[model samples]
Target chain A: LAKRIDAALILKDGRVVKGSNFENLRDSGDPVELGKFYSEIGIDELSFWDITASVEKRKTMLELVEKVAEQIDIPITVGGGIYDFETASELILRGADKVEINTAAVENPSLITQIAQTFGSQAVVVYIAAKRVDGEFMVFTYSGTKNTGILLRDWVVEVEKRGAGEIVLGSIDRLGTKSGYDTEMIRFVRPLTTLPIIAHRGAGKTEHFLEAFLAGADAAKADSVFHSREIDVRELKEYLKKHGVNVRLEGLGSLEHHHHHH
Target chain B: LAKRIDAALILKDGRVVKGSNFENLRDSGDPVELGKFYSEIGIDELSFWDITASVEKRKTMLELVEKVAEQIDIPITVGGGIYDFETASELILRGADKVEINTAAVENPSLITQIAQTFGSQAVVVYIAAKRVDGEFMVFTYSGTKNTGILLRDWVVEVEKRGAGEIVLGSIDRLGTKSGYDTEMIRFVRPLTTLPIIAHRGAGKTEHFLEAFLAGADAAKADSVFHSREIDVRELKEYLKKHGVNVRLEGL
Candidate 1:
C-alpha cells in the first residue's frame, strides 16, 4: 500500500512531468500511477486522492509522500480530503509543498479561508470541477457526483477572494476520454478572475492544450495520452513554443522566464 | 535469555496468579480477567514477570512448567524458549500437561512433533518478541537465535516421546509492553507445525490483542497481573477449554 512514486518528475534535460490519475486498477474510486515514471519523464506538481481512506490506508498514503519525495528534487502539491487541520499538518511534514482542499471546502466554504490563514495562502490550492450542463455551467463535489447547490462562477470568485493563490479548474465531463479541453469553460472563467487557472480533467491532445491556453488557462492536465505515450511532453513543449505560447527551451533558464515575458 | 519464574500462581478455584512473565499478550496469550479490578483476595494464579509478553511490552520471558501446572486444578504448563526436547516434551507436554516453546526450537528445534506425534500435550505455545534486540540473542534460521548452539535434544523427540500436545513459547525480554507482536515470526513457523503455540510478546494489557490471535494463534493471550485485580481467569472459562492444561475453575 505504501509504494514510492515520483512526486515530481525531473527529466535528464530538466523538464518536469507531473503525475495524474494514471489508471484505476482496483476500481476503488481512485487511480494509481508510477509517480516515479512521471519524475523520470519530468513532472513538477503531484496530486493524490484518499481513494482508500481506511485508517490503515491513510497512514500508508502519508508514507508514500516520503517515498515519492525521496526520488526527485522539486515541489509537490497533493490534494484530496484535507479533512482536518491535523491531516493538513501531516501532509506538509511528510513532504507536500502545498495542500489541496476540495470536498471539505464545499461542505464548509469558510474552511478555505481558515486553512489559507494558517498555512499561508500560497500553500493552499483549491480544486473545482466545472461541468457544462444544458449549455450552462455547474459546480460538483466528490469528483463530480454531488451538485453542491452553488453556482460555479460564484464559488471560484469566493475562493479567490478567500486567499486561494492558484485555482485548479477541472471539467468532469472531459475526464478520461482523451478529448480536447473545455475551451468555453476556460474562456468564461479566465475573464471572471485573474488567478492562474490550472485547466484540469482534459487535454488529451497537444492541440487541446494550445486551445486551452488561447481560452486563457494557465496550465492543463492530460492523463490518458501521458499514460499511453500518445503525446510526448518534450515534443508538446516544442509545439507550444512554436505557437508563441512562450514555452521554455530544453535546459532553459526557468519556467518563470516565460511567465515573466508573458 | 530464558529464565525460570516462580510464584506464578494459579488456584484450583480458577483464580490464576500467573508469574509476572507469563503474559499471553501474543496470539496464543490468554486473558482471564478484564481490566476491572477485583479484590486481590480472589487471585488464583500469582504470576510474576521478569518480562511482559504482550504485543505492547518490549521484553517477555517464558513461563515455568511445574508452577503453572500445579497452581490450578485446571492443568497448566509454561515455557518461553525451550531448547532440550526432553525438557519441553517431559515437563510441559508429557509430565505437566501443557508445553510452551520460544526462539530455541525455532532455530534448531522443530515444532511439528509437539503437534502430530504424542497428541497428549494439550497446547503448543510459540512465543515471539515484538522489538529487536541489539547484542543479546543472535538471529538464526527459522526465526530463532544462533549463539545458543544446537544439542542432542531434537525438537521432534521432546514433543513426540513425551507426548506433548501443546507448544508454547515467545520472544525474549518482551512482554506486557503494549508494543504489538512479532507476528511475522510466529506466522512464518505456524503452518510448519500442526500443534498450535500461542504467539507471545507485545501485549501491554488486555484489550490490545487483535492481530496475533487473528493471524493464526490457537488461543488468545495477555498478561496475568496487568489486569489480575480487574479480571481473573478463575472467574472465566477457557474459550478453548476442550484442549488442555487451562488453569480455570474446576468442573467446567
Candidate 2:
C-alpha cells in the first residue's frame, strides 16, 4: 500500500557525475547505459538533473531524455532549468513522468500551481535546495548558488499549498559528503506537510538510507553510492528487506531462483 | 618540482551542493564552512565553478570569493562564465589564483592564448567537458549540454598549443558516476600534450584515484568521495603513497 519503499537513482548530468562538498564534479559514464543498468537491477524510479540547466537558462536536452526513456521502463523524473509549464509539459511529453522545479519556482512561486494545473499534481514535484544559515535551513536557487532567504518549513508549507505532488528536501550541508541524511531536518519537515517527503543528500551507505526512512522520510534518494558501483541496488534492497524494512525487490525473483538452484 | 602533486577542492556553487549522475543537485551546506574544512585538512588547491554563471549570463560573485579566500590557505582556481581577459583578471584581483575557461574558450578559442599571455600561462587552465560519441570523445560546452564537435585528442593538443598551464580533463560520461576514471581516455590524451593533465570524472574510490595516476595523469581529482566524508583526503594520499603514487600528503 505504501508503494513498496521505492528504490531510486538520481543523475546529475546526462552522465553520472560526483563531486565533493558539492563543488568540483567528476564524470562517471553514459547516463543511458547507467539508467538501463539500474532499470535492469530493478530501481523503482530514476531522477535526472541537468545540474547546469537553470544556471545556463537552457532546457534539458530532449534528445538525452528520449534516449534514456527508451531504454528504461521505470518512471523518470527530470529536473534542472525546468522553469515553465511548456518545458515541464515538454518533458512529460518526451517521456519524463514528472518534472521538478527549483530555481524557477523560487523566482515565481505561481509556477508550481501553473505546472500542477497543466500536468496534474502528480506530474509536479517541488525540489527544495536547502542550505543551513544561522542555524536555520534556507532555500537556495540556481543549483544552490543563490540563497532565496526562504525558511525550510515555510517553503515546505508554501509548496504543499501550491499543490506539489511531492517534495524533495535536499540538505545542502550533507550533500556529497556522504555524511548521512539530515534526519533531524527530515523529522522537522515530516509533520509540517502531509505530502510524501523524499529525503536526499548525505546518504553514503545502506544504513544511511534506512536511517532516512526511519526518520520519517517516505523515500530516500542517493547518488554516489549507486553510481560509483559501491552499492548494488538489488543487494541494498535485499539488505533492507532482511532488516525488516519494506522494500520492493523486483529482482528478488532472480535471487530466489538462484538460491533454489544453489 | 611538479607542484607537489596537489590536493584540491572544487565547488559548483557558493554553497555546497551534491547530486548524482550530473542532474538532480541538492543543497549541501555553506561553501565557506566546507572550504574552511578542506583548507584545515590541507588541500593543496581549490576550484570553484559558479555552476550557472554562464547560463545565467552573470559574473561570479566576487563577494563570496573574497569571503572564502579569507578562510582558506590554498590557491583557488575559479571558473564559470569567465568570457574575457578583464573578467579573468578581476577574479585574480579578487582572490582566484587561476581562471578556468570552458565554454567561452570553445566559442572563442583565442581567449585561451589571450588569458595566457595577459596573466601568464600558469594562470590559464583549459577545462574540457567531454562526452563519448561514436567511440570518440567530443568536447561539450555550456556545462556538457552543448557539443562542440571537438575531438578530445585534438582539443588537448590545441589547449596545450594555446599555452594553457594545465588541463582539467572532465569526461561528461564519467562526471559523477563514481565508477572510476576513464583510464583509456587519459592514456590516449597523455602523450598528445605536454601540459600537466589533472584527470577528473568517474573517481569514486581511492583505487580510482590511483588508477588515474597510473594511467599517466599528472594529478587526479575527485568530488563525492571527499565531499561526502567517504574517503578522507589524508588517508587517500597515504593509501596512494603506500601504493607507490607520489602524492603530497601535507597534512599527514
Candidate 3:
C-alpha cells in the first residue's frame, strides 16, 4: 500500500483546539471549517479526537461529526469518550467513516472484537498513546493522564489479534514538540503486527514525516505543522515524491509555495 | 396560578416509552412526532425525560431535544442525565426553554442555585421522584432507583429556597398505574413550597387529573393516561373546568 498522510483535529467541547502535550489548549478553529480546509488541501485522511468528553462525562456530540462530515469528502475517524457499542455504532451511522477507541478498549479489551465483528476491522481504529517511563514505552489512556502499566510492543500485537483495523501510535513524550516524529518508536512497533500503523504524533518537518514512512509506518499523522500552516500538504507531498516515496499527488488542487512565500 | 395540564414524554434512547413503576419500558413513538402531536392537541406544556441517560452513562443527546424542539412551538422541559451547568446551558441554547435536574441536583444541591442563578429561577425545574418508604415520602434519584433518604417535604422546601422555578414530583409507586395521580403527595408538598408543582405520573382517568388539581397541584402532568389515547387533553381539561378547577380553557 502507498504511504498515507493524515492530519488530526483535537476537539474539546465541539471546538477545535491546539494543545501542547495535550494541555494548555488554545482555540484553533471551527471543526467544520478546519475539516473542509484540510480536505480541500488534499489530505489523505482526517482524524478528530474529542479530547475531554471522557473527563467531563458526556457523549461526543454527534451533530459535530455530522456537520463536519457534510462539509468534507474524506474519510473521518472520530474518537473520545466512546464507552460502549452504541456510541461507536452511532458515530458510524451519523457520518464518521471509522471509530477510534483508547481507554474504553484497554479497560475492556473485548470491545475491540465486538466492534470489529459488527463493523469489520476496516472501521475500527485502536488508538494508543505511550510515553517512555523508566526506559520502557508505557501505555497511557484518558488523554494521556492515566498510565495502564502496559507496554506499547505488547499492546500493538494484542490490538491486531483482537481485530482492530488499524493502530494509532502516539508518543506523549514527543507531542507538540518540534524535534521530529518518534521515528524509533514507529520502527520498534513496525515488526510487531501487520496492522496499518498511523504514527499520530510528533512531526515537525518534511523529513520527520518521511522518517515515519521509512520506519514502516503506513501513514504519517501529524498535527502541529499542518495545523499551523507551516507546511503545505503539497509541499510535504512534493518532498516525499522527490525522495522516491509513493505518496498520492493526483486529484489535488494546484500546488503552491505556502511555506516560504513572503 | 391556574391549574395546568401538562403531558410528559418518557424518552428511552431517543424514542418515547411506556413504563410501569419505571420498569419494563415499551416503545411508544418518535419524539418529534409525539411532541408535535401534543402541541397540536393543545397541552399546556411539554416535559421530556431521557429516563435512562444517567443509568446508561451518556449525554441526553442534545439533537433529540433540538429535533423535538423544532417541531413543537410550546416550551420544553428537558431532564435526565443533566449533570452540570454546561449540559443544561447547551440544552437551553439549542432549543429547550427550560432544563430539568433530578439526581444531579440531589447529588450536588448547589447545582440548583448555579443553573437557577444563570437562567433565573423560572428556568430551573427541580424534579423529585419519591415513594412512601415505611411512612415518609423518601426521595428517589437516578430515574427512581437509588433512594437518597431525603423526604419529599424537606426536599420540596429546599428546592424552593434554592431558586428553583418549579418542581416535578413523580410518585415511584404510581408510575404507569391506572389508579390515579398521587394527589396526596401533591397535597402534602403543596403548602411546603410556593413554587409551581407539576404533578407527574399516575393518572388513569380524567378524575385522576381532576383530583391532582384539587390536591393543590398547579399542573397535572400525566403520561400513561395521555400516552395510551385513553384520556384526551381536551376531555381532561373540560372535566377540570366542570369540576370548578381554575384551569385554562381559552388557549385551544
Candidate 4:
C-alpha cells in the first residue's frame, strides 16, 4: 500500500470565514459543526487558526480548541500566537496533537529547536506564509501582513536544519485568488528539506490539489472551496483516486462505494 | 430612477487570500491585479484593509493602497488602524475616497463624529465586526480578537447618531464561510437604524446577495467568491437584476 496523502481543513476563529489574499474576511459558520462535518467526510486532519491571536499578541483560543477537539477524532493542529514551549504545551494538553509556529519562529529561529526538542519533531510544524516579490518568494510575518524580507528558500532550509518535523507552506500571492497552487514554489522548496511539505492556499478545485501533490506537496490544504460547498471531500478523494494519487479512504462510505463502481 | 445598490470589493493585504472565520488565510494573488480585475467587472467601490494595522499599532499600507488606488476607476475606501482624522485624511490624500474605522471607533465612539465632521458624513463608514453570542450579536474590536461586549443593535444606533453616514456590518461568525449573508442578522439591525447597511461576509452565491437585500441591506460586499472566480460580479448583478434588486449595472 502506498503512503496516504492528507486532506486538511483550515479554520479561523471559532467559526469559518473565507477571503482572498488573506485580508477581507467574507463569510463564516460554526467551527465545531464544520469540524464534525469535515471529520465525517474523511479529512485527514483539521487545523484551527485563531487568526488574530498573533496580531493581538495573545495565546491561542484554548477553550475553542478544546471544543473543536472534542468534536473530531482526527489529529488536530492548533496555531496562532504559539510563541513559547509552555504555550505549545498548553495547546497540546488542551487537545492539539501538533502546534504550528510562524511569527515566534521568525522572531527567534532558535525557538524551533526548542519546540522540536521539547515535543518531538513530529509535533512541531513551521508554517511559512510566503509572497512572491520581484521573482523571489519572501516570508511574511504577523499573519501575512508584514513582509519580513527573508527569502522563503533560505527559511525552509533553516527550519528543516532546526528540527522542524513538517512544513505547511502558504502562498500569500495565490491565496484566495482561486488561480491555483504555486507549484513552482513547491518544486523549488521540495529538494531543500527531507521533511514532509503541506501545501496550503490556492486550492480551488480537485485539480489544484492533484497539481499540488505532483508539484511536490505531500499533503494539500484548503478552506473556502470546501467550506462553500463548491467541492465535496469524498468526491475530491474519488477524483484523486482515479488520477493515481494515493489518499486514505478507508472508512468513508461515499468514496469507498465509488471505488467499488470501478 | 431608483438609486442603484453598490457592489464593493474588500481587500486585506497587497495579496489576495481567502479564509474562513477571519482567521485562516487560505489563498492569495497580487492586490493590484485583483483590484483591476474587480474594477473591470463593475464593482461600484473598493475597500482595502491592512489586516494587521491595528494589532500591530502602525499605519495602514499607504503605499500599497496608493498602488491599488491607481488601478481602479471606482471609489476606494481604506481601513484598518484608522484611529484619527490625520490617518483618515492621509488615506484620502493617498487616493482613498473614504475611510473605514472599526477598533478605533469602538475604543472611542466619538471618533465617528470627528471623522464625519472633518471629512463629511459620506466619508465616514463604521465597520462593525459582530459575532453572535448567547442569542444576541456582540461587537468585537482589535480585528475581532477582543470581544467588547457591545450589542450590535445598540452600537448601530449609536454610530448613526454619532454621524456615521453608512454602516458596514460584518458577521464575525460568517466571515469567510461562504454559507451566505447573515440575513437574519441584517434584518435584525435594519429596523434599528436608518443608515444604509452594507452587508459584509457570508456571500457564496448570488442568491445570498439577493437574500441580504431582501432582509433590508442597502448593499452587499464579497471577497473570495469573486476573487476565487467561483462567481462573477457581472453575472451576480444579472442574477440580482432578474430577482428585482436595484443594482447599478451601468457602463464598464
Model 3: CAPRI class = incorrect
In order, the interface RMSDs are 32.6, 25.4, 24.0, 25.5
For candidate 4, the TM-score of chain A alone relative to the native chain A: 0.85
Q: For candidate 4 chain B, which ten residues in a row score worst on lDDT?
A: B19-28
lDDT of 2: 0.73
Candidate 3 residue-wise lDDT at A179: 81
Quality of model 3 by C-alpha lDDT: 0.80
- Off-target runs (Cα >4 Å) in candidate 2 are A1-13, A18-28, A52-60, A252-262, B1-252
**What are the candidates' individual DockQ scores?**
0.00, 0.01, 0.01, 0.01
Q: Is candidate 3 or candidate 4 better by TM-score?
A: 3
- Give the CAPRI class of candidate 1: incorrect
**True A-B contacts kept by model 4:** 0.00
Better candidate number, 1 or 4, judged by TM-score: 4
Residue-level lDDT tens digits of model 4 in B1-252: 122334444445454445222222233355566666667777777777666534433343677767877777877787777877788888777878889999878755656776776677888889999998898999999878998788998788878867887899999889769899998889999899988899888888878888888889888777767666677778988887887777887664
lDDT value, residue B163 of candidate 4: 81
Q: Which residue runs of candidate 3 sit more than 4 Å off their true CA positions?
A: A1-262, B18-28, B52-60
Give each model's whole-structure lDDT: 0.51, 0.73, 0.80, 0.75
Q: For model 2, state the Cα shift of residue B143 in Å.
A: 55
Residue-wise C-alpha lDDT for candidate 2, range A1-262, written one tens digit per residue: 2322333444454545652121112323667766665665547778877755344334446777887788777778887767678878888888888888888888888889988887789888888988889989899986788888889989999999998999988888887687788999899899999998988888777788788888888887776667665666767776776687777643332211101122
lDDT of 2 by residue, B19-48 (tens): 322122233466666666666665667777
TM-score versus the correct structure, for each prediction: 0.42, 0.46, 0.47, 0.46
